[PDB]
């Protein structure tokens, strides 16, 4: 129902805030102290994401069981692309919070984690190279919410999404919205399909990062490294 510019303004209006971490954590970072700060932040961000998802145009039209399936499928992708976005203007650093600017070497405090640090930093380095605009970013974040669970059969449920036809209709609108934004940037027709392709190809790498980060967080819970808050626990448990 909304126009292309109405689509962008609505997505910009629903943007979640940038939360903070603890103002005086353990000064020498440890494996448990690091994972505690990250899981505490993610659990607080998840509450703001649920309210943001309800404002994504077309999300409220789905049934309740279709709404949950899309959120358990893409909650880590959305949190990761949000971190990559605010880490754009910080080369070699990840802006987890304004008071938690972590570098690549500091990611080695958690075992098997720097591999994901490098993948997130490479994603941020590419957005910087293509000069990603904020209107393009909110578009890609909404694509992740609607597309990451359309064909996905979660192991904890063995079922997928029902309203397939409705999701692809909204996804076509965001595709037009993306192309519309590339035109306002003065890009040519050829430059439009190429940039649209490069943007959606990074969504594959973000999907890969979420699966690698999901297995890592599961091992951290099984190793008693960090307790998981009930909401973050339920989001992770939806994949096992």
């Amino acid at each position: 129902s909304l126009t292309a510019d109405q689509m962008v303004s609505a997505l910009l209006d629903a943007e979640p805030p940038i939360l903070y971490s603890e103002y005086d954590p353990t000064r020498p970072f440890s494996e448990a102290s690091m994972m505690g700060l990250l899981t505490n932040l993610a659990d607080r961000e998840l509450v703001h994401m649920i309210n943001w998802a309800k404002r994504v145009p077309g999300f409220v039209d789905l049934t309740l069981h279709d709404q949950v399936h899309l959120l358990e499928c893409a909650w880590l992708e959305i949190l990761m692309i949000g971190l990559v976005w605010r880490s754009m203007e910080h080369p070699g650093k990840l802006l987890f919070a304004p008071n938690l600017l972590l570098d690549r070497n500091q990611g080695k405090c958690v075992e098997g984690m720097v591999e994901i640090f490098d993948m997130l930093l490479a994603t941020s380095s590419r957005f910087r190279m293509m000069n990603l605009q904020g209107e393009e970013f909110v578009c890609l974040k909404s694509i992740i919410l609607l597309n990451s669970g359309v064909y996905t059969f979660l192991s904890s449920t063995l079922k997928s999404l029902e309203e397939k036809d409705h999701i692809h209709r909204v996804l076509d609108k965001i595709t037009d919205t993306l192309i519309h934004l590339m035109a306002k940037a003065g890009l040519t027709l050829q430059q439009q399909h190429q940039r649209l392709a490069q943007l959606l190809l990074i969504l594959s790498h973000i999907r890969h990062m979420s699966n690698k980060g999901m297995e890592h967080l599961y091992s951290m819970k099984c190793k008693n490294v960090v307790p998981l808050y009930d909401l973050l626990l339920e989001m992770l448990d939806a994949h096992r």
Binding site: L64, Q67, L71, D230, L231, M235
Partner: peptide, 8 residues
């Protein structure tokens, strides 16, 4: 069923 509740 926390996300199940916060959506409603």
């Amino acid at each position: 069923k926390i996300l199940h509740r916060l959506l409603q």
